[PDB]
Amino acid sequence: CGIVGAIAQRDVAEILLEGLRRLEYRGYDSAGLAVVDAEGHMTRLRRLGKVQMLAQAAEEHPLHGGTGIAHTRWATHGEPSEVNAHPHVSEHIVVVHNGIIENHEPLREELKARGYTFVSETDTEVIAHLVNWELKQGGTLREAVLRAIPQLRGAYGTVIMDSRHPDTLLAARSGSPLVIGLGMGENFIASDQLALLPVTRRFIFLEEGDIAEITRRSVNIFDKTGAEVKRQDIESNLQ
Amino acid sequence: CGIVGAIAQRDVAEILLEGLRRLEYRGYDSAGLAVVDAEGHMTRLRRLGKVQMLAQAAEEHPLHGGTGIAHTRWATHGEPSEVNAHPHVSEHIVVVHNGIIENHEPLREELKARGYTFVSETDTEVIAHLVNWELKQGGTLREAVLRAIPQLRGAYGTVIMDSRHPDTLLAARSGSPLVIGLGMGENFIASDQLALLPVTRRFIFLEEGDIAEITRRSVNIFDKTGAEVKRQDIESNL
Ligand SMILES: N[C@@H](CCC(=O)NO)C(=O)O
Ligand SMILES: N[C@@H](CCC(=O)NO)C(=O)O
Ligand code: NA
Ligand code: NA
Numbered sequence: 001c002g003i004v005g006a007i008a009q010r011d012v013a014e015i016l017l018e019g020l021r022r023l024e025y026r027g028y029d030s031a032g033l034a035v036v037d038a039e040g041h042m043t044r045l046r047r048l049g050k051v052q053m054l055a056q057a058a059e060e061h062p063l064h065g066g067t068g069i070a071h072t073r074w075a076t077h078g079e080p081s082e083v084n085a086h087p088h089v090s091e092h093i094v095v096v097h098n099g100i101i102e103n104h105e106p107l108r109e110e111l112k113a114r115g116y117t118f119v120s121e122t123d124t125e126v127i128a129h130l131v132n133w134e135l136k137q138g139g140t141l142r143e144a145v146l147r148a149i150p151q152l153r154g155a156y157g158t159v160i161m162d163s164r165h166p167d168t169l170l171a172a173r174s175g176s177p178l179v180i181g182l183g184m185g186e187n188f189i190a191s192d193q194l195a196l197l198p199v200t201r202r203f204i205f206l207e208e209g210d211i212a213e214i215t216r217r218s219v220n221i222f223d224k225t226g227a228e229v230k231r232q233d234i235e236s237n238l239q
Numbered sequence: 240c241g242i243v244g245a246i247a248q249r250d251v252a253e254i255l256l257e258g259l260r261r262l263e264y265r266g267y268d269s270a271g272l273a274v275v276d277a278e279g280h281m282t283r284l285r286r287l288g289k290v291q292m293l294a295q296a297a298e299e300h301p302l303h304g305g306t307g308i309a310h311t312r313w314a315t316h317g318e319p320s321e322v323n324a325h326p327h328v329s330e331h332i333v334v335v336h337n338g339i340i341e342n343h344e345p346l347r348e349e350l351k352a353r354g355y356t357f358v359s360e361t362d363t364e365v366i367a368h369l370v371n372w373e374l375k376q377g378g379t380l381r382e383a384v385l386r387a388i389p390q391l392r393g394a395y396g397t398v399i400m401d402s403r404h405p406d407t408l409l410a411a412r413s414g415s416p417l418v419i420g421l422g423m424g425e426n427f428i429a430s431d432q433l434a435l436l437p438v439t440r441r442f443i444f445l446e447e448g449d450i451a452e453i454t455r456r457s458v459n460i461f462d463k464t465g466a467e468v469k470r471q472d473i474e475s476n477l
Contacts, residue, residue, distance in 0.1 A: 010249040014424055184254055184437055198423055201440065201476065239440075239474055 001028045003096050003178065004195045005069035005159045007169050007216050008186030011035070013063040015188070016070035019195035020051045028072040029080035033058070034087040034094045035068035036166040042094065046085035066186075066216075067166040069159045071096035077104065078121030088120060090128035092164045093135065097124040098191055099156030099176040107151065127152070131160055142213045145170045146226050149211060159189055169214045173206040180204040180212060180219055182233055187214045193236055201236045240267045242335050242417065243434045244308040244398040246408050246455050247425030250274070252302040254427070255309035258434035259290045267311035268319035272297070273326040273333045273400075274307030281333065281402035285324035305425075305455075306405040308398050310335035316343065317360030327364045329355065329371035331402045336363040337430050338395030338415040346390065366391065370399055381452045384409045385465055388450060396445075398428055408453045412445040419443040419451060419458055421472055426453050436477060443472045 002023025006012035016033045031054045032046030043063045047054045051072065071086035077100070078084040086096040101107070104123035107130060112118070116129040130151065134144035141162050155175025161168075171178055171189050181188035181196035181203055189212075190196050193203050204219060206212060210229065212221045221229050241262030245251035255272050270293045271285030282302045286293045290311065310325040316339065317323035325335045340346070343362030346369060351357065355368040369390060373383035380401050394414025400407070410417050410428050420427035420435035420442055427435050428451075432442055443458060445451055449468065451460045460468050 008249065010247065010424065018423065184257065185249065237476065239476065 001026050001074040001098060002072040002195065003069070003098055003157060003159055003189070003191040005096070005169055005171070005189045006067070006186065007214055008066045008183065009216060010066060010186070011064050012066055012068045013058060015199055016068050017051065017055050017058060018198055019190055020070050020072050022195045023072055023192060024051055026072070028074050030082070030085040031070070031072040032085045032087050033068055033070035035063045035065035036161065036163045037065035038166065040164050040166060041065070042163040044087055044089065044094070046082050046087070048080055048082050048085065065166065067161060067169065069094065069096045069161060069169070076100055077123040084120045084122050086124060088122065088125045088128045090116065090132035092162050093128045093132040093160065094163060095124065095128045095131070095158055095160050097127055097156055097158040100154045101126055101152050101156060102154035103152070127158055127160070135162070141165065141168055141170050145172065145211060146222065146224065149174065150224055157191055167215055170211065171206070171214065172211045173208060175208070178206045180206065180214060182219070186216050187219060189214060193238065197236070197238060202233050203236055204231045204233045207231065240265050240313040240337060241311040241434065242308070242337055242396065242398055242428070242430040244335070244408050244410070244428040245306070245425065246453055247305045247422065248455060249305060249425070250303050251305055251307045252297060254438055255307050256290065256294050256297060257437055258429055259293070259309050259311055261434045262311055262431060263290055267313050269321065269324040270309070270311040271324045271326055272307055272309035274302045274304035275400065275402045275405040276304035277405060279403050279405060280304070283326060283328065283333070285321050287319055287321045287324065304405070306400060306408065308333065308335045308400060308408070315339055316362040323359045323361050325363055327359060327361065327367045329367035332367050332371040332374065332399065333402060334363060334367040334370070334397055334399050336366055336395055336397040339393045340365055340391050340395060341393040342391065366397055366399070374401070380404060380407060380409050381450070384411060384450060385461070385463065388413060389463055396430060406454055410445065410451045410453065412447060412449050414447065417445045419445065419453060421458070425455050426458060428453060432475060433477065440476050441472050441474050443470045446470065
């Protein structure tokens, strides 16, 4: 339901939690976040329940790290439970996802043959394992995600990270909104500009089919053929 | 002329440089910045000339540190020169200043008599040595500033840091504008909100006579008798 992600020099957990607070009004059954520090140490915290519960859990875990993604979930596939909450993982691959992967069944079956254990009942978990799978075939996270995305069917928005290389976030808009917020030496992404207003007012709205590679210093957006596309940033007048 | 300051977890040099760029339209002859990392290592860079010259020098010096102050100067006391540019230092005390300290002469002699060496011809440098002096007498940087400000006469604003304790900036508004920018786990200060728009839109204007102690997580504002005052934060997108 709500996605927020950030890639910064400063710790981003508090920014992710504030963004999720801003996305609650939409409604949801659970929420989670994962942050990775510069050494690739990932901390993931999820809760069945409200962001406030997640925030209270985070208070006893000071999550350090400048790369992170967070999500509030309105369950479609798999009952609300902590196991099914996002972020989902596949070793170092961590994903948050809005929407539905229509063809999750056949995909889940392939990945099971490839030796992947599904721990959740979500369609989402297929994204994580599949990117893990593609990445094993060689190349950067961007290249792996360019191969993964066309295999996915449905109306979805996803942000992916590799905890081993916390310097890049990949995001793909494919039926669900995502917008990039531009910072000074940091960048953010959310499913709604409203989440990011406390830290930036300058946005790039991704378009349908866009895949964005986001680092602290650059945003590069591509279509599914790997062609670079140019998207304009705009200043938001909202408060 | 322009002051920008920041206290953050992330490196702030680029934010300071961009704030100075946003203050150039006012005019100036020199500019400088100082940043301190968590271990109290201070890097100070100043240039006679344009902010671009400073930004170019900074690119060969990548300045690390989450606490910093920066300034564009329009010379009033002491000709434009790198020596007279701010920030000025007195060992670990680092200062930027807008305005004029009208009683700088009596204070300079007083601090010379007290053993300080003035390297610059500015009135500004007296602030740095005066705070350093008061701090020697004991107490926190806020307490020292509280004692120092009443000794100064003039229309001025200043932001002060102690590289030994990079977790706090002190600012005093005494006839020249200063505004605090509120961030998330970081805070900023500038002589003009225009400087800070890239990083925040929420501001607290300091009022005349206010002394603010700013950390990454809190802003505490006091008057000269040391009473805590409450100032309202405003959202302001220009
Ligand atoms: N299908 C995924 C995501 C549902 C969601 O939150 N959409 O906004 C799930 O059930 O977890
Ligand atoms: N009097 C100080 C600061 C002058 C000023 O405000 N310039 O804009 C000096 O001469 O350095
Ligand atoms: Na789609
Ligand atoms: Na004054």
